[PDB]
Symmetry: C5
Subunit: 256 residues, 5 copies
Amino acid sequence: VEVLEVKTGDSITEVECFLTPEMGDPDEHLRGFSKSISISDTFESDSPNRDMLPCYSVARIPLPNLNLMWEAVTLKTEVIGVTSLMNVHSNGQATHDNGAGKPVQGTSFHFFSVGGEALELQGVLFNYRTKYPDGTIFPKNATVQSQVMNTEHKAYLDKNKAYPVECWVPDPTRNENTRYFGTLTGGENVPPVLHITNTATTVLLDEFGVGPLCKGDNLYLSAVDVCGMFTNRSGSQQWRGLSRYFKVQLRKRRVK
Amino acid sequence: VEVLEVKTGDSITEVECFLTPEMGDPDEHLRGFSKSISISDTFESDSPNRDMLPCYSVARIPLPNLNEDLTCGNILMWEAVTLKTEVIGVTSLMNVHSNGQATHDNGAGKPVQGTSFHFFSVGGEALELQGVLFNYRTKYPDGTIFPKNATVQSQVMNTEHKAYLDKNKAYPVECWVPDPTRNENTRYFGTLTGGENVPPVLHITNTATTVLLDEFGVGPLCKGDNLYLSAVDVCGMFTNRSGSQQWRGLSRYFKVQLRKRRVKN
Amino acid sequence: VEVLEVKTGDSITEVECFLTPEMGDPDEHLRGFSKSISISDTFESDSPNRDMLPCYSVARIPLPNLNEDLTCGNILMWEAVTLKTEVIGVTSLMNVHSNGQATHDNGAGKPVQGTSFHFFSVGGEALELQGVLFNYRTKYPDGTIFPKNATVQSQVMNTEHKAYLDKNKAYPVECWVPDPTRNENTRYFGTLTGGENVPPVLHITNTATTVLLDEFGVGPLCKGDNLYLSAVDVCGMFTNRSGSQQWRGLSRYFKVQLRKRRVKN
Amino acid sequence: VEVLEVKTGDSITEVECFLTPEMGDPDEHLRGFSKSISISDTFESDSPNRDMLPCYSVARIPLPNLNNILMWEAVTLKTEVIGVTSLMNVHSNGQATHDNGAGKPVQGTSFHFFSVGGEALELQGVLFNYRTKYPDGTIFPKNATVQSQVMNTEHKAYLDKNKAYPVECWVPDPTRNENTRYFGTLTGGENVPPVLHITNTATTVLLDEFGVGPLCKGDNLYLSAVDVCGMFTNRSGSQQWRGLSRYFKVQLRKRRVKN
Amino acid sequence: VEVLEVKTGDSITEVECFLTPEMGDPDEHLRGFSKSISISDTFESDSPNRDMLPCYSVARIPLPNLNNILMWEAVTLKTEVIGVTSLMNVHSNGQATHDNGAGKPVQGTSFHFFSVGGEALELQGVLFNYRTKYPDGTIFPKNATVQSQVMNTEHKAYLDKNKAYPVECWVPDPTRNENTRYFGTLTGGENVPPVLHITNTATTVLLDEFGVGPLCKGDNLYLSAVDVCGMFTNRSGSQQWRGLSRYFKVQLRKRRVKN
Ligand SMILES: CC(=O)N[C@H]1[C@H]([C@H](O)[C@H](O)CO)O[C@@](O[C@H]2[C@@H](O)[C@@H](CO)O[C@@H](O[C@H]3[C@H](O)[C@@H](O)[C@H](O)O[C@@H]3CO)[C@@H]2O)(C(=O)O)C[C@@H]1O
């Protein structure tokens, strides 16, 4: 694609939506939570249940039909419902005798991307002998080299509630037509730090002034917002996730 | 709807006030504190008492009346340009001698610490809220305004839960956030820091100004010559000698500079 | 005053000094420390001893006398333009080898840590204070200047509690903050870092300058040719072998550059 | 070398690759992990096994042959740690953080380091303990003395072999490395949380204060990395270093020089 | 001094060196470490062993002889802590963090400090405890009173000797040092983790707000450092300060001055 001039004047459109989190939803009451975590006694017996595995969120958003391509230029984003983590009274584990419940805390992954095609993924496994469950899409034909880098494990984020967070990352060797951003903060005691504001804009243009170009007039939004773990009275722990807001401004760009 | 020129020359005004916190105030002695926190026996039976729930603070400030004479196709509106804001009384959290829980044998009292939410907004109309529930089966108490007709989808995003921050001491902090799909005429800023051992970090200065203009150079436009200020400043929890814990909040200072803007109807 | 031009060409002067901390000084050996903290048996019986309460530091520095001759409609005032400031003696906190509680079996002494308040201001008049009480039923001791006629409102915001920082070793840190509704002719800066285990982080350099000019390019204007410097540097608590804890403070260095400004009075 | 003009137009090339971590690989199932850490009874008896010692990673990348000569000049770097989300596996023979809890995540001491140069990274040896016996198959500071615990200028080496130079023995030599750009952070402590950022939007410029990047001697580019993310604690309490791969994309341009 | 024009053209020189740390060196095997830290029962009985007290490091570096006179002006600094990766040795006579765990890494109170001046660093004495008896072989605040715990203006000195000025009783005097640039950070706490960054891409400019750097009196450059990284905990629980060397590269230029 040779990228030519931006159209001016009906030349702009805006996408506004939320992506709900996919933490595992172990029953009809627990949308936004995983199953409580259980630990294998060996690497060879690691066999996580599907409802215990957070997955990447993805939305494919149809744009007004053009034939010109829609170019994504700016992003406003934030995590929705941050104050829900102040619920320290719902059968949690008292931090000490007569105390409030331990708040959601521990390992977090906050990730979002905007692209003109599916996010491209590279698989990396903590433990190559993990048995990933039916109904997930995971690195296949894993070897011990999969624990550091096995170039066989290439995939597209092309299905919601399917690609487990722990076995996939954005492929840095691809994603020319996507902008992605993420932070992993690890540790059982890590405090959530979540900022909200409607005054912050991210520019999606690359060093040549070109944003993601939407193939087939489709915009791809992807997210993970694992906020940490909720600790039950019993000590059992569940991942807790929150929805992500996206507002994307697009303009019409001529290409050859 | 169409923004035209700024008026120069009585063309500017200043709002200066403080918003007190609404932490629950469980008796006549405990303004600025919640009731001690109680944990439900089951997840399903979560039922927080009203005086255990911090709520959003809101003030609506009347500005000098504009458009006292018939005008033709145009009006003036106050436009909020700048904000100075500060948490008031940060040093009160150095009181570690008032029947708190010693950090160790013969030690000082554990200071206020743990989960905090520091939030402020300036708008030309009420802050628009979206409801998100930690637990959709929580029973919220009489006297609060909370997400109604809650479903399991309320735990992640139920678009039915839309509200306006239009009553003080009513909207629980844990139920509601700014609605990012609205609030075109408000500027809002907040930080949640979660964890029982989180240390308060509170900065004060009279030298810091926030500009409220959007990317087109337009600040909030005050409908009916009213300015809406909203805040939450849950600083953490105070731990009593017994181990019981209460939220502790502080007041927020606002100084807003406004100018007269002509707009086309 | 209406501010006119800067005088050029003895048109500039410098103030250099240090303010000692006022942590309570409980005996002839314990300058820079408080009395050990004791916790009241009930919340209502809070009654801290004077030597247990850190206080704000203040110095009023006379400047070269201006306006010795009769002037007509105008005077000169010293205008404070820049500040360099530093906490003095940060390395003293490396003394973990005396009178302390071992971090663990055979370990070094626990260092000074926990709640800190680092605050400084430069003004052309006394720092204006607003009182906020953690507990309105606290009995503040004789020899301190504290919020009087306290009510439950005093726990969040009682506008009766207005004072000037006009006495050393008198205004307890925990009772008072800079009044954000005043202080037009002062620049103030402070950080409260709460929590019992928070680690001191103290930077020193002679390369950092703070500019004291407001958004109109005007610094504090010194009424009667007096400069007011104020500080708090509560670094945290020292822990004795017994577990008893004492606040520890350090001195603050100020270097202020001033210039003569003509004003219409 | 006198550095003259940049060529314009065929004048650019790109290197894209990844460097795998070299954490010790103690068995056929534990690529990316070290051996469990064991502690010596005395300073005198410190004798770490080779599979317990993370090493520097290095790649020598041949560039298109160019030959007053032309040299490839490295101008920009994009870099990323690959597989940050793998650290969310808290269910694979980890130590529960409390009764009925999830497994302890990887945490504690980390070293994240990368360099781009026109020749091998130059190393200086510094030893925690000069009486440590380093194992066969590693390249370590030789003829160590007590001064090796602070600065022994005898300990000079080139990062010229993969899986060989232990991280704990060697640092970039700040007295050399004029033709390399290096960047590293040590975060020390047993409970330190990993903080790992990923984005494809971040570029590092490799030009010095004279506008000159690394110049590739013999048309070879040198990439080096360490990404020790922390320690994995298994159900027994034993701890292993865990590393991840690093992505590099380098843009180069032809520069004329007089040699 | 009236400061006139910078010379251009033979007009520049560079100083490159390292300063070793002086942590106390309690035996012939423990260069870079202090003696184990003990706790006196009272402020009155505080009598630290010389070998337990880290000291400031200083080097006086002669510059090319120059002689209105010319003076060398220090313009830029690159600096680095040398050997940061040595702190990854958690296998040498350490105290396991928990059953079967690795050694507790170096952590706790750190002081990282450096200065570049045209004359000795000017010091001000501040005592934690005015009753501390400083040992023979150290230079310490004399005639101490209880006011020495906050500010006693009698305690003025120059950093004019190695292995002499204990870190804990001296700081740079902010009321002097007009001809020095100094930078330091004290990070307190029992368990604070080291955070140490290395790069050869970072330059500090030493010019003041008038565009003037340190002017070297008698053609001598003064470099000072402290890099107490934290404490090493032994298997017994006993703790020792651990220090590392600091690299300095200073660029200087000739400046004409009057008087
Ligand atoms: C947020 C939340 O739902 N917390 C629950 C968790 C989670 O639902 C679960 O861990 C997610 O995977 O479950 C807790 O335990 C309950 C769970 O094991 C259920 C499963 O049916 O059984 C409950 O005990 C039953 C018991 O099995 C019956 O024999 C008995 O007649 O009734 C008991 C009470 O219903 C467990 O309490 C958990 O701690 O993991 C409870 C949390 O509140």
